[PDB]
Every structure is written in structure tokens, then in C-alpha cells.
Symmetry: C3
Subunit: 203 residues, 3 copies
């Protein structure tokens, strides 16, 4: 389940090397690229040192089990550097900015923005037309299914570097000031600020 996927560019007398079905070998007679588990590929490189004379190994993760979300057909905008796990629901015309991180089970509603370097923890739920500020953290609640995650209702603005703690609901149309730590449910149409966040105005 945990994997250490590598891509390996190779060159040499490749016709002399046979590759197992466990690895995807894209090669011609002298040069090629190999895709597979490092444990499998390492053995191949070692046992064929005579014919594979040079190689470059690329690797981006170690003992990782959860794949990344396939972005190619999503009806929304995902910028370079955003890391999104599989099993995340991205609503129509949402925007996921550079270097944001979104964990499994998260939901991002239609038209919502997750700004740069923001973090959505497991199952965090963001409604429609929300703005989750840069560096803001929505706590995760990976399991059980019955455990209330962070829920941000529609039309909410969450300030930069905010933290919303596990199981907290931010009510519709509310505003959370930058830097706040939200420890309790926020009533709809109110502005909260501080650590712990307190209501400072009714909208």
C-alpha cells in the first residue's frame, strides 16, 4: 500500500536488458525512462550494471499510500504547487491557489477560493462563494465518518493565518479576522476576531 515510486532515465545497451511487467519501460536501443517502485527498479539497475551505464533517479515521496487527485477533468482552477489528495470534491469554478494543501475528504464548494499556502485538513468542508485566506488552517477530522469536521457555510471570509479548530462551524456570511483562532461556532452574519475568537460586530 505504501509506495516509493521512481522515474529513472537510463542509457546503455538496453536491448540486452529485459524488464518485468512490474515496471513500465519506455525505451529504445540506447536510451530510456523507467517507471516503477524503487525496490523493483534498484534491483534492475544493479543486476544490469554492464548494460545500463548511467542513470538519473527522480523521486518525490517515500512510503506514501494516498495518491494525488487527478485534476485533468475538474471544472475548476488549480494552480501549480497546490497539493490535493484523492477523494477531494472540488466544486464548479472553485480556485485552489499555489502551495495550498488539501487533505482527503475535503469539500470545496462552487466559486470558493482556497488562497496560497492555506491548509484544509481531513474532511474540512467549505461552502459556496467562500474565501479561505492565505496560510489559514482548517483543522482535520479524518475519522470517524460521524465526527463533525470543520464546516464553513456559504459566503464566508476567513482571514489569512486563521486557525479553525476541529468540529467548529463558521456560519453563513460570517467574517473571521486574520490571525484569529476560532474555538467555538461562529453565528451567521457576524465578525469574529482574536484568540480565542470573539464576536466583535454583527453584520
Amino acid at each position: 500500500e505504501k509506495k516509493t515510486p521512481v522515474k529513472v532515465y537510463i542509457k546503455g545497451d538496453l536491448k540486452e536488458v529485459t524488464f518485468p511487467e512490474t515496471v513500465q519501460a519506455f525505451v529504445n536501443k540506447k536510451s530510456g525512462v523507467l517507471f516503477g517502485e524503487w525496490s523493483e527498479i534498484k534491483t534492475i539497475l544493479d543486476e544490469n550494471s554492464k548494460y545500463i551505464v548511467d542513470y538519473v533517479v527522480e523521486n518525490d515521496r517515500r512510503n506514501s499510500a494516498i495518491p494525488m487527485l487527478d485534476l485533468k477533468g475538474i471544472k475548476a482552477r488549480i494552480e501549480p504547487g497546490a497539493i490535493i489528495r484523492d477523494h477531494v470534491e472540488i466544486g464548479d469554478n472553485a480556485v485552489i491557489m499555489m502551495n495550498a494543501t488539501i487533505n482527503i475528504g475535503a469539500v470545496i464548494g462552487e466559486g470558493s477560493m482556497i488562497d496560497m499556502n492555506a491548509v484544509l485538513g481531513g474532511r474540512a468542508t467549505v461552502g459556496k462563494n467562500c474565501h479561505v485566506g492565505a496560510g489559514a488552517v482548517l483543522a482535520g477530522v479524518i475519522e470517524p465518518p460521524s465526527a463533525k469536521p470543520v464546516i464553513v457555510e456559504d459566503d464566508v471570509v476567513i482571514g489569512a493565518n486563521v486557525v479553525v479548530l476541529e468540529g467548529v462551524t463558521v456560519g453563513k456570511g460570517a467574517v473571521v479576522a486574520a490571525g484569529a483562532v476560532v474555538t467555538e461556532d461562529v453565528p451567521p452574519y457576524t465578525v469574529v476576531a482574536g484568540t480565542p475568537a470573539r464576536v466583535i460586530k454583527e453584520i
Copy 2:
């Protein structure tokens, strides 16, 4: 123009496949790598499956319009994982650390450091010899061109996980305490701290 670029490693009887001008195909008879739009390349893979035996598709962005900054000739240091949009000015001898993010229109002065996981929003301006702390956020003001962005003057230290709000100027030589939220202009050569940030020293 929103794009969905892909890089596709491919193999098969590749001479039998004709690639359009829209696709850059670096291939030989047996194997190759294709660069282009997903819409374009998906069509090619499906229609030529008779000749394509296997492939691997890589993709890092979806419906993305703004390209990344070409770093190759910049007289500065940019570390792996830093994400910098095009139309950003990076001063001589600046340093951009791993996992920082710098949005369009930002300006970083000579000798300044943007630390790990810091965020410079749209049009945010940083002077010379500044240090923007890890995780600090300089709010963005993307438009209109007449809206004042965040302006950090020279010789400033911004603490880790600070937020400087839209349109605020942090004056020359000031220090902002870690975790502060700067909600109004900071006078030159003062220390501010707290949320909201208040003058201390």
C-alpha cells in the same frame, strides 16, 4: 487563456502516429515524450491506441492562465519548491526560500530574504535588505492598479506568521513581532507587536 498542460511519456509503433503542430513530440520509432494541452493529447492517444501500447501522463495544474517566472537568468537565489508567478521583480542578491509563494506584480528588493512558506500577495512590495519571516503573509491587492498594495520599506524585519493587511505600509527599519497582524501603517524604526499590532518600542 486557461490551460491544462501535460507531459506524456509514450511507447508503441510511434512512426505510425502523426502529431499536430500544437504538440511537441520528442520521439523515435519506439518511445517518446509529448508536451501539450490535455485536450489535444487525449484525442491523439484515443485515436491512435492501435499504435500506442502504454503511456504515463503528468499534470501539475488545471485551467491555469498565468505562467511561472523564468528563473534561469535572475541574479538571485531561488530555492526548490518556491512558486513564483511571472511578472514578479526579484532584486539582485535576493533569496527566495523553499515553499514560499509569490504572486503576480510582487516586488522584492536587493538583498531581501523571503523565508520558507511565506506568501507575497498580488503587487506586494518589499524593499532592500528586508527579511520576511517564515509563514508570514503580505496581503494581496491584485486590482485596480490604483489600489495601494502592501509596502514593506527597506531594512524591515517581519516576524514569522505575521499578517500585513491590504494597503498597509511598514516603515523603514521597523520590526514586526512574530504572530502580529499589522492593521495600520507602522512608523519607521519602531517595534510593533500583537493582534492588532501596536507600537511597543
Copy 3:
């Protein structure tokens, strides 16, 4: 050790590595020793320094029909950590410099950033987008919350780094300032800025953090 870190950093030359996919009449091109060329007659890829490869592309323009240049860093001297043999879990997007110790069964989450000299103990979790500064030390069975920042120090070598002792929980978006020790079993509330040592088995909160329990 700290002296070794400083010496390593300065023995490393600044690099601008590229990967360049090329095609054309490549048999007419002689690639220099300084470049790794994985090529066939028709097409291939080149690994090397931009300054070296740019020269090649120019001087052989008549033989190179097209190319794509990839680059992810500029004037960068410290390489990334080889993850392939580490007995831990490191997720995509995590950026870890060489000369970092990752303890058995640790977890480094997506988009975390770990500077040179850092030490992460066994079974500890560094959560999403957290930052470990130079020489920052995290004990065993710790949890460093998402977005939390542990201060760094590289120079001088004698300077005290941030030390997180065992069994600690650091809340999300917390900042621990340089030289601070967070005591064994302590809990730091989300959003706190820790400005002085935290006694073991206490709870601290606020900015500046103060003992609450």
C-alpha cells in the same frame, strides 16, 4: 554537528540545473563531459547546468529542431534529501534539505518544509505546511501542527536552536522563537507565539505564550 553544517553549505557551489528535452539531427552533435545526455539519433534529454547547456543549444541550433527546458531552482547550493531509503513516510510536496535526520516511522506531510540540520525523532508527525528552521530539533512522538513554524539558526554554530522535547503537541500556526526549548509533554495552543522555554507537562497559550494549565 553545527560546524559541519556551515562548512558543507559553503563547500557547495550554486547551481542552476536544467533538464532539456531536445530533437533534431543529434548524431551531428557532440555533447561535452559536463552534460548527461540520454539520447537516440532523433531525440533525447539533457541533464546539466543551464550555462553549459545554453551554450550547446546555441552552437548546435542548425542541428537542434526544438527543445523544452525544465528548471526548478536558481543559484541553489544545498541539495535535497535522498528519501528512497528512509524508514519513514514523506508525502508529495514536502521539501527537505540534505543533512536532515528523519527518525524511524516519522511522518512528514505535504508541503512541509524542513531546513538543513533539522532533526525529527521517531514517530513524530510534521503536519501540512509546517516549517522547521535550520538545526531545529523535534523529539519523539511529537505533533507539529499545520502551518507551525520552528525558528532556525545556522550561524553561528554555537547558537542554541529550537528544541522540541519528546511527547509535545504544537498547535497549528504556532511560532516557536529561536533558542526556545519546549518541555517534554507540553502542549502549545494553536496560534501561540512561544517566547521562552515551556516547562514540561504544562499547557501554554497566547502571544506571548503563558502557562495556563
